[PDB]
From a paper:
To understand the structural basis and how DNA is stabilized in these complexes, we determined the structures of PspF1-275-RNAP-σ54-DNA containing mismatches between −11 and −8 [RPi(−11/−8)] and between −10 and −1 [RPi(−10/−1)]. Interestingly, DNA with a partially opened bubble between −11 and −8 did not support transcription, suggesting that this complex is unable to proceed further to an open complex. In the RPi(−11/−8), we observe multiple structural conformations, at varying degrees of tilt of PspF1-275 hexamer ring relative to RNAP-σ54 and varying degrees of RNAP clamp opening We also observe significant degrees of promoter DNA bending, demonstrating the wide degree of conformational flexibility in the complex. The DNA density downstream of −10 was generally poorly resolved, indicating that this region was highly flexible. However, one conformation has sufficiently high resolution to allow us to resolve the DNA. In these complexes, we observe a previously unreported interaction between [name] and σ54 RpoN domain. This interaction is only possible with the tilted ring conformation, suggesting this interaction contributes to the stabilization of this ring conformation in both RPi(−11/−8) and RPi(−10/−1), giving rise to the higher-resolution reconstruction of these conformations. Significantly, we observe the σ54 N terminus is further shifted along the [name] hexamer in RPi(−11/−8) and RPi(−10/−1) compared to that of RPi(−12/−11). This would thus support the mechanistic model in which we proposed that ATP hydrolysis and the conformational changes within the hexamer lead to translocation of the σ54 N terminus; and RPi(−11/−8) and RPi(−10/−1) are further along the transcription initiation pathway. Second, PspF1-275 hexamer ring tilts, as observed in RPi(−11/−8) and RPi(−10/−1) structures, altering interactions between PspF1-275 and DNA, which could contribute to or stabilize DNA melting.
Author numbering:
A (entry chain 5), C (entry chain 3): 5 to 259
B (entry chain 4): 1 to 259
D (entry chain C): 846 to 1043
E (entry chain D): 52 to 101
F (entry chain D): 253 to 302
G (entry chain M): 1 to 8, 11 to 46, 107 to 475
The structure:
Amino acid sequence: KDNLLGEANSFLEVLEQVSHLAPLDKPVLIIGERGTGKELIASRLHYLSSRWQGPFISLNCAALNENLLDSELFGHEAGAFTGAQKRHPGRFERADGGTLFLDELATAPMMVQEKLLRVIEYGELERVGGSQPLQVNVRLVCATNADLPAMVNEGTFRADLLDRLAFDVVQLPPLRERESDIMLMAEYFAIQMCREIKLPLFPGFTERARETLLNYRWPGNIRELKNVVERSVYRHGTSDYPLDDIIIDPFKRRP
Amino acid sequence: MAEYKDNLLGEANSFLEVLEQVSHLAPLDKPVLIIGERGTGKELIASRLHYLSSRWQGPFISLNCAALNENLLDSELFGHEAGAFTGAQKRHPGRFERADGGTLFLDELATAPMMVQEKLLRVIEYGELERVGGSQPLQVNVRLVCATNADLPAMVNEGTFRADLLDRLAFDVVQLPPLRERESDIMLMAEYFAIQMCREIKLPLFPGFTERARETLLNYRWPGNIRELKNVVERSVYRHGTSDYPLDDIIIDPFKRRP
Amino acid sequence: KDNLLGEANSFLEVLEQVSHLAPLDKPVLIIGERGTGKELIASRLHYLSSRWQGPFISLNCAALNENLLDSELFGHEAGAFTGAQKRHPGRFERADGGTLFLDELATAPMMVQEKLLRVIEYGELERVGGSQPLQVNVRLVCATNADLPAMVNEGTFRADLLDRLAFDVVQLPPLRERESDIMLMAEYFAIQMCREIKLPLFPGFTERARETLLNYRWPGNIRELKNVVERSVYRHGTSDYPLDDIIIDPFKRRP
Amino acid sequence: GPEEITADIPNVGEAALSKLDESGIVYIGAEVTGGDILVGKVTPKGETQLTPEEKLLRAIFGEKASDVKDSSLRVPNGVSGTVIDVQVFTRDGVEKDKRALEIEEMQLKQAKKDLSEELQILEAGLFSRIRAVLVAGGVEAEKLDKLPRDRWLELGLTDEEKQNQLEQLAEQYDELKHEFEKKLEAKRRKITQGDDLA
Amino acid sequence: ERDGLFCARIFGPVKDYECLCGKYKRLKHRGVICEKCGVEVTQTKVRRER
Amino acid sequence: VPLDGGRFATSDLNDLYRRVINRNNRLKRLLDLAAPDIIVRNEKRMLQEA
Amino acid sequence: MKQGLQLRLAMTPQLQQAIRLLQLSTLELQQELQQALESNPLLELPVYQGETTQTLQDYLMWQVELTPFTDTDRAIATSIVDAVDDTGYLTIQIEDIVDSIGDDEIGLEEVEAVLKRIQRFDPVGVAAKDLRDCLLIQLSQFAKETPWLEEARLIISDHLDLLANHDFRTLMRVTRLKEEVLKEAVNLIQSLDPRPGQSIQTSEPEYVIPDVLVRKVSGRWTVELNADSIPRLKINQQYAAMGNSARNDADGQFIRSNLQEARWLIKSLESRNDTLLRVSRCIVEQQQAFFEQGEEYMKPMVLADIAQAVEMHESTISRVTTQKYLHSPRGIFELKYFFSSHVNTEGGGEASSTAIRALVKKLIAAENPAKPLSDSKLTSMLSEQGIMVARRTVAKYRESLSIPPSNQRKQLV
DNA sequence: AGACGGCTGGCACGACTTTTGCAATCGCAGCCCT
DNA sequence: AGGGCTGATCGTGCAAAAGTCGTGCCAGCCGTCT
């Protein structure tokens, strides 16, 4: 409950959908532009979820090691291997009732897709040589920049992985897609960043550069705008600098 | 005795006859092979069989070839008694050793390890199991059950499936109907899913399935037999609706991004 | 010695050659059709070998794991590593004079080929950091469905892997091949299926369907015929069903 | 173990049990001379080991085992005379009703005879109303006297006013029968509500 | 109670001539003092008189 | 004087002089440990009172 | 990383002793704490009421004193009476009393004469002494005019062994008399002053201090630790405040060492209490079937896995698990009593040797008193339960139950 | 009237419990020896 | 003026050998009916 969402028509509809689906512990899908921070809305929903007082631990799918994927999704029972002690619940078993936002879900491999399909079922967690699997119910959350239907058509993701998704795939509109309250939200973010960096304000201010960059691609739908604003503020290094000669082009070399 | 299936997610056209034939083969403990859509009509069939499974107290231990990693798979498969293979400790009850006399519930994971398939060929050869570093092999008994999703002959001709794996297996074939083919209990299953959603979500009443919704579902390819319909119904219920419109503008397909 | 062998000219010659080489403990290859029951015939000949009263332990060639190649082909001396106690002889060392029946050798890896070449040496059981190797003599037998010459031409089979077997390769005829005791084996299989299905007998009996299926490839030379016979017996659902409208086609969608 | 009144007093004279009813308590109205025992409660007593001496005692006499301390009610000294009646109250969760069922039965008999009499009057009023509605219209009182027959079941003394009156009175009689049954049920529940001790 | 209120080996004799521990459990035993506990195995008048 | 039998309900016979004696034994142990003179004096304040 | 892994302290003396005291019992730990506090310098209506033979002992002596007897005769009677067990028979015979006295004046003859004079005084058959002659004394005191009195006397004299098996037919054959001819005599012998006072003689009171009390609060029985029976370790804060100001380093160091030892001991006791509570909760969860249904529904319940999964291991918990009791609706149950045998499995099996004994008792009860039922029937019941007892593997269970069957003891109908 | 038979109790061994018996090395530095 | 070395303070586990049950299983016997 802290993201600098524009609260525009699309933003308000997305927030309403997230709040409505917050009580539901069923798995949900997040579509749209990554790098923009749809995960922040996921954390907000998880806080607003029914398991609000539950240990929510998200995970990056690409983070798990291939040969340690089993140790990632579970815990070594220590009845095997050279490793001792262990008997430590897996990240999902560590949460066991909270929200596990699947990060880098599109980065999941075919083996990872199959492991997720195995996890599409409820609980049944058996450790290394476990006597009996353990069932633990936890709410599920996933995000993916790439198109899950596109991956399935490519066959990169397993079919059950798509079938693992149950709730609506919330798609994030790009920077140009909404562009209704992005000016206000970016201004608020810039004000907060200036306060944090002991910068009072920008006396020059102005939005002619902002109005022009409204007709800009901004591939990083939300993060890129803030990064470019910070770069412009730092490079200008002055407050009484209006939105003139300020464009989103930090990599660009001056002439 | 008679154990009712938890769900009866089947097709009126011929899945009733399929269940009848399954009950006919229910008494036998030989290799029972099911087939159908993966993720949809498959493990629902497995649960129905477990309800129709012979006797009781049988460990319906289910294993998926995706798990158990790669190197650790063999130890959990054959078990482990000697040290340095299971860290010494107790003689590790392997995944196969976990279910003695129970159903060996298979999932159509298609383990790319031909070594896994070769291990499984010896798994059902004479009913025996030897632990890792085990000085003595042990003859074990258990039931077998599986569900399928791909043409085992097509893979075998392609070499993807070992000829010996299908030779030892595939005693009898039980293919679940594809969703685009049955088209019979579609209304029945849709009504059951809608009622279940209304009950769980505490909805005052089922909004109802409009003719446009039924027509779209019939036109829908629905690659998944028993789950894709379930997921679509869940998405439509999530989209929600007033009491006024029974199913007007219902979002069954959540993959469609909004404007 | 429980297999209902066809005793065909092929089957009888196979049994006779098996008995002739039953006293000899040299490596040999049981060639022909796998899935058809080479393991049962292997057990019968082991009971029929020179050391009939011996501990015979067979296993799948590719059953074990790659990292545990030493732990499977030998015993953990436990001097090094996290392994404790152990000092347990391998399954081959568990036989200690028995028949190491090679099964599923077609799936063996290059490391497995190297281990087999090491096994071509006379005994020489050296553990990890063991004092000295132990030479242990046991009977050897091999069975596979693929042409080891074909693999060696592909280079998959090592030269020593090809030379691992010390006798001429004895081939098992296919169902489309032997086709001799097809009526007798069919009748025995039908009797067994009826007994298992609690059916006293099939009043229809007859072999017109059996004769038609005789003019079929039946790739699973014994496996396919038995599975198909059991399937037809179950599908008929009535004893008074002659060998008509019965065929081997489990996969085909019935009209 | 609770002290249960079953006249199963260990080492009890036969005459002592000869007075107690099977309920541990005695019959009613019975006269007691001297310190007579009326209600024999069996307070549990402590147990012991194999005690082969006591094993032989059980093999010989048995049935005592020193397990039930006698909580029997014996008449007080200088107290002897007629027992007019008794009262037994059992806490909720205990309803042996060995003679409590009989007492509640007598009480409910009186209670129902009360409820019937009012119900009897109501039913008689309805029946006479039906007979009058059918009277003077070919349904002779002799027809109604021989069988209530719902006064020949709307014989047609008027067949419209008689018929409508019969329908209304039938509805009323059904309601009254339902009400009387409900009242009897409530009274039976109250009588069966039992006692509730500490 | 061991060395408690009205303890053995103290405050006079026991209820019976049998000792609390059990050693020297007889009314005939007069001078025999139980080794387990040194208390009077005699009449209990001394219990008040001790 | 156990009225209900379950509880002794010592009719003014439960001697805290037993607790005082326990405190005196603690004082004796501390004296064996040679406790501070303040503790000794306060030990008397309680033990000597008995 | 890969399917590979790796492997990863040492203490002794003081902590070892601290853990050792935790392995002890409740009252034993209370006594140990009381003794330890005796040395710790920094840690924090004459004769009640009763009746003649209130605990079954003085009525006989009062009756003897109510009769003329000499000082030696009174002493012999007192030796007989005071040495009478809770069963009413003379716990110590004349020889034991004479040996304890060591006096030749109180001889066997004098003690025997005193006992015979007090053989039936108040009540009949006092100081009975392995009561076989006391039954005969009761029969003789009973009027000889009773029917079959000669038959009863003959049975009581030396036919006790025959009637011990309750083989009335075999007893009659041995006595060369018709079966049930002395049935009135046998019944009278049964009703023959057993232990004289018997239950009145049995003044055996009840004492119990279970280490826990299972209230079974709304099922899933709520195990409440006996906090009253659980001592509270109090450290003398006065010594703490009187030691810090001590300029003498010796006194300050002694006080600091005492405080550290008290802290370690309190930690050990608190850990013992907490582990006992956790293990009791686990046992209650495992054997609610035993708690409610009874001994028949007994499955093994020794703490494992769950204790290890929670913290440390079952090691030293097996040590501290000793001597823990619980008062429940089923009764008083011990810690080792909570753990049972394994039948369905090697460990934690559904049935138990206690369940075997309970089923054996039920089956032997479910038979005619003449002949108890075959253990093969209870064996078949166990096989239905999955234990697969069989008649031979039941011998041990029957011996544990010690129920006398027909072959062990044949009673005549 | 000696053998069936279930008892029973001894006899046996693996599987689960247990309990007991295990803590150096400092690292200050100053004083004392060299 | 430089080396020695001085004892402080240093803590919740487990495991290793033993025991010990649980279950089963043999051996005889007495109640007995033959």
